[PDB]
């Protein structure tokens, strides 16, 4: 007495390099929280800040004992190259505001897909490259939904 | 020697009001536990009860030294307005049963998104508004999976 | 060295009213699950039930601090006005069965496009109006594929 | 005991260049959402904004380690060269409004099929070039259906 | 106050056999993607490969607990009987290239309308017979549009 | 250096009434699927059923806040006035079978061009009037091609 | 045992120039929709607007990296040179109305067969030149059938 | 109050054999497209190629489970027996060029009315025998209109 | 430098009544298809059946909100008054066979020019009165060419 | 064993000028349709209007890059020089009515054989000069058959 | 003041058997991760491995106290019957590699839709059948995107 179920959908990658990503760690999701224009209403204001993490597994330091990352993603302005713009349904989200990411070095990384981060040190096996998320305003902000996306390119 | 990773997805909000939510505290998840119809099989039975928590951070009492919450969510019946109904895949979950939430005041709150809770007192900075979860039956219950959802609206 | 790609297709609406829909939330898709005639074979049986959600964004309560919804869609019978009939390729799907939706009030809503739901309370900004999906049989059911569709009209 | 079925229709391209498009990513569809003239009724208003994505696969950086895109599509006006006009059945859609796309650089791209975007950096293999969609009004807008189309030309 | 609309056109089949096709699943359309001669320029090269699906519904295993498929369609050569040739407007599409389909068994099926596939196992109700599409070159290929068609005959 | 192309052919209507049809929605085409006489071989059998949709755009409720539809088209018999007969090349299609359409009310509508449907409720702007297609046999059916046509008259 | 069938009729062109047309794309047909005099009853009114597309294939930019189009077709008036008049059986169609086409530039093109459009940019291979169709009234319009035709001349 | 209309003209055939043709499928018309001498200017050049289809309906495999086709039509030369010549008004069409048809086997079929094609396999009911149209030059071609005709004889 | 062309020949009618015919719709031509004596060899056999259409335009319901049609044409026999006989060159066509037309009511209409059809309902403007063509044998048929003609008289 | 057939009759022209006519396009026949005195009963009434086409082939723009047409034919009155009178068997056709032709410019052309039309632009090869036919009454019209003829003179 | 929203689309099944699937658990998606050819470049190599889960709900052991699963899906080779092949856009994904699934028994299951798994033990209510995903190479692998699909058939 057999029956039908449905469909399964596996994902992943195959990439020939030093480390290997737990792509859930990249596809990891964050809830930065609920934020106010009471503080984040200035051309330069940084709200308080929240952590982010990366996971690598089973890594050979001989191919590359080091690593870094570049990001891309829709930035706001040519004078705010390290800021990420938001992506939610139209007429909903906020304005005069973006998102900033901080390296291990506390560094505002550019969204170009070239601006590689600091050369992380890699052990054998497993590592972690934590970044710290926050908002970096671009003037008096709108009370709006906040939702974003950025692509995770890596250097070894 | 660069490589691809994948996608990142940040979340949050921007809301101009007194306090600011750690939206993980709202998106906080509970495992109430495994429960029996041995006790929860009556039009009025309350199973034993479990705690729930809220987190606010960096709050100015001058905008609002107080706060409260209304909830909404699929209730069961018009005579059981303070009960929450369950949301799991069909043919699986239980019946003749719902969920109750209790305020700081031990109060059965309504699921309408208007029925604001007790006016919490707010300090400067950080606060906590714990609620207590439990089941509130609506007759002899089914042995079924229990899974729910409710939206978290706030007053300041 | 340029090349061809292909076509892009954007969608949306422009509607002058209080709130604004994340039309992905309406075009949101559900997988209620796999269900049995072991329970859903009666003129009145309700299978266990699953949740559904709505999203509004950047809403002014002054235009309308409230809101509701009517639905339409192919119902089955004039004596089952709150039931939705199924829409899959012919000779495949089930029979003597439909679908029910439940309001926040646990209410069997009619498929007419007029039967507005309960007057939701609207904050400023962003809200959620969860409904709960389930099957509502119309006698002993066929083992058949289950697939449906309903249109999402709104009141403010 | 054989029977008839029907017709199948495969699609694709063959193009000799650096990367190769997942033409579903171009033929990718967006639901920007439902939008209001409450905000989008000005010669310059930008509604809140939503994300868009591109996919390339199995790319050799030696042919071209870089890439960009030009778009074409029916724009509205010669003074609004970066705006896209809407394409739905006549007498239905809105007016005094169009659509804007934003580069990774937050750039209003022209609809000519020549105005190549920023030179994306390409790794080996797989990349992503996210754009951000929104409306850019051209005065007080009509409440109308919103539906669009734009062609996706690429530079390597 | 009545008005004119226009014409409707329904389609389908009536076939007396074990299963019944969701002829949208056959008339299902694929966008394999954009492909390069950088890899697909050899008498035998297989580009990377994409999936395809079939849908049957409400099937009796007693008439036939099994099933298979033959295809026909314009192949290229008598020495490439399992390859499908392309069908787009003249002077546009590519050359020295075709299309291959793969069975559940990873099998290059012939385009004759007789070469029945592997005997799929059929449950009661609903099934799926996924195939995998790709290109199978016949020498150094032209950069050209790629567009195809194949007829879907079935065995029970 | 100019050249010849060919001919273009636009279509449409101009009708002075409440709503306006996206006549593609009427000229919309359906593939109901492949169907069996295993179930559809009775004077009254209804095969499983598939959905159909209508689109109106930019509608004023003041001219008419309501609407309905009558259909015409070659029916089979005077005792089967709500059934549609099939229209394919002769000696090909099936027999002892027709097609049924179901209103929003699940109603077998007559093919006369007068039998107006239920009075749909019309909002401002855009609406949808989904119908559900299926076969309604007239005895033991032939295995034959199934192809139909019906005209779409409207009431406001 | 042979039999008769009938006649086949192929079509096309042979033209020595840069690109080559998919003459189905020119002979492409549109259903603009059903339209009202409620809006289109003014000497200058533009109904909402619908898209149109062109297809070129296997194009050499060295012969001509650019291209444009002129149209001809029965216009209405010498003061409405960019308007197309309608062509349906007599006493049927509407009056005090025509049709407008819009370039990629949103430009009212003349029906002369000389007024070449904007110089499109041509890649190698395949391109698309979308136009946008709509009605451009010439006073209070008749409720009448709408049907048109225009010839597609090209510049390289 | 009766009136005159006009004349109707039905067509068809009556032929006693295995299958039965949808003679619209034979009388089916193709628009191969617009083609260039840039590629089609050689004694042997094949332009890129487009598909063609056939339709049979309600076929008994017992009379003949197989089928094929011969063609006739004005060919060009005794050394180009598989080429079709063009038929348009004099002084208009092209020269040093013809048309080729390809079988399911990718076979240049002769225009004699005897050269039967590959023995297609016939199911019960309905089948399809797709051919692929293209040009096969006979030297440097004229830029001329392209228009053709060929008769469709069948084997069972 | 003028030249000669040739002759033009316009046609039509002028008739004072409710609706007005698109006399192309009457002079519309059908290709019913190729048919077999395998089924159509009985005193009463009806081959499978194909559709036919009528077009009226710009109609006033006040002169006549209704309409119908009578036909005439060479019938076969006084006992087969609803059958149409065939008209092709002598010694060619078939025998023991005719043609049947079916009303919207599925009605065998008489060829007399008096037997008015069902009273169609007429809207304002444009309507359609589809009929369905098929063969109605008069015994074992000849394999012969099939070609017919019938005159289209109308009632308002 | 030879037999007799009959007579063949070819036609055409030989004219030394820029373009060459597909004299079927001139000898092309139109069925304007059935028309009413309900609208066409005024000294100036124009019924709704239908299209007409011309075909030229293999044209050299160097002899003449331009072209136009004059018409002649039996007009009605010296005050209605642009109207064409009707030519059917006597006592049959209508009266107080004629026919009008419209240029590409929407121009009432004179029937003299001198009044050359607008200077069409000619490409190389093939062109089209569409005109639009309609009736232009000369008072209250008779219900009568409508049939006409006009000669097609050309300028280069 | 009502407005339009959009469309909803529910899904599911109705199947008469012991347990009932949370078809989200089948339609559950996995991100296995990013993988290297540094280890997965051998005819037999198994990369490290990741978990997968199933969900059943409200199950009666009396109909069936046991259960198992067969899978189907495009495998690679007849000598690698337990391997799943990948399905992403062409020219993108990897090669000389597939995917393996492991039963509760650590068993390489076949993709046939018949090879039922181990007989799971079923309690009353709710169960879980975890599988473990990994790659099983077929030689030295390509660095390519990895994406798959497999159908979930069940035994009770």
Numbering used by the authors:
A (entry chain I), B (entry chain K), C (entry chain E), D (entry chain C), E (entry chain A), F (entry chain B), ...: 3 to 158
From the paper:
Following this pattern, the type 1 pilus usher (FimD) and chaperone (FimC) help type 1 pili assemble into a composite pilus structure consisting of a short tip fibrillum made up of the adhesin protein (FimH) and two minor subunits (FimG and FimF) that is joined to the pilus rod, a homopolymer of ~1000 FimA subunits. Once extruded to the extracellular surface, the type 1 pilus coils into a rigid right-handed helical structure that is capable of unwinding into a flexible linear fiber. This ability to transition between a coiled, helical rod and a linear fiber has been proposed to allow the type 1 pilus to act as a ‘molecular spring’ to maintain adherence in the face of fluid shear forces. FimA is critical for proper assembly of the type 1 pilus and, as the major subunit that makes up the pilus rod, is also critical for the proper display of the FimH adhesin.
To characterize FimA polymers that form the type 1 pilus rod, we solved the cryo-EM structure of native type 1 pili appearing in a preparation of recombinantly expressed Type IV pili (T4P) from the E. coli K12 strain BW25113. The FimA reconstruction had an overall resolution of 4.2 Å, which is sufficient to build an atomic model of the structure. Overall, the type 1 pilus is a 70 Å diameter rod where each adjacent subunit rotates around the helical axis by 115° and translates along the axis by 7.7 Å. If we label each subunit along the 1-start helix by N, a subunit N0 interacts with six adjacent subunits (N-1,N-2,N-3,N+1,N+2,N+3). Further, in the structure we observe the N-terminal donor strand of one subunit completing the β-sheet of the adjacent subunit. Most prominently, the hydrophobic amino acids Val5, Val10 and Phe12 in the N-terminal β-strand (Nte) of one subunit are inserted into the next subunit’s hydrophobic groove created by a missing β-strand. Within the cryo-EM rod FimA structure, residues 25–29 adopt a helical conformation and residues 30–33 form a β-strand interaction with residues 10–13 from the Nte of the next FimA subunit. We can explain this by the fact that Ala22 in our rod model is tightly packed against Ala93 from another subunit and Val37 from a third subunit. Pili formed with the WT FimABW25113 protein require more than twice the force to unwind than the pili formed by the FimA BW25113 variant with an A22R mutation (~30 pN vs. 11pN), likely due to steric clashes caused by this substitution affecting the tightly packed interface between subunits. Interestingly, the non-conserved residues within the FimA sequences are all located on the exterior surface of the solved cryo-EM model, which is likely indicative of immune pressures selecting for antigenic diversification.
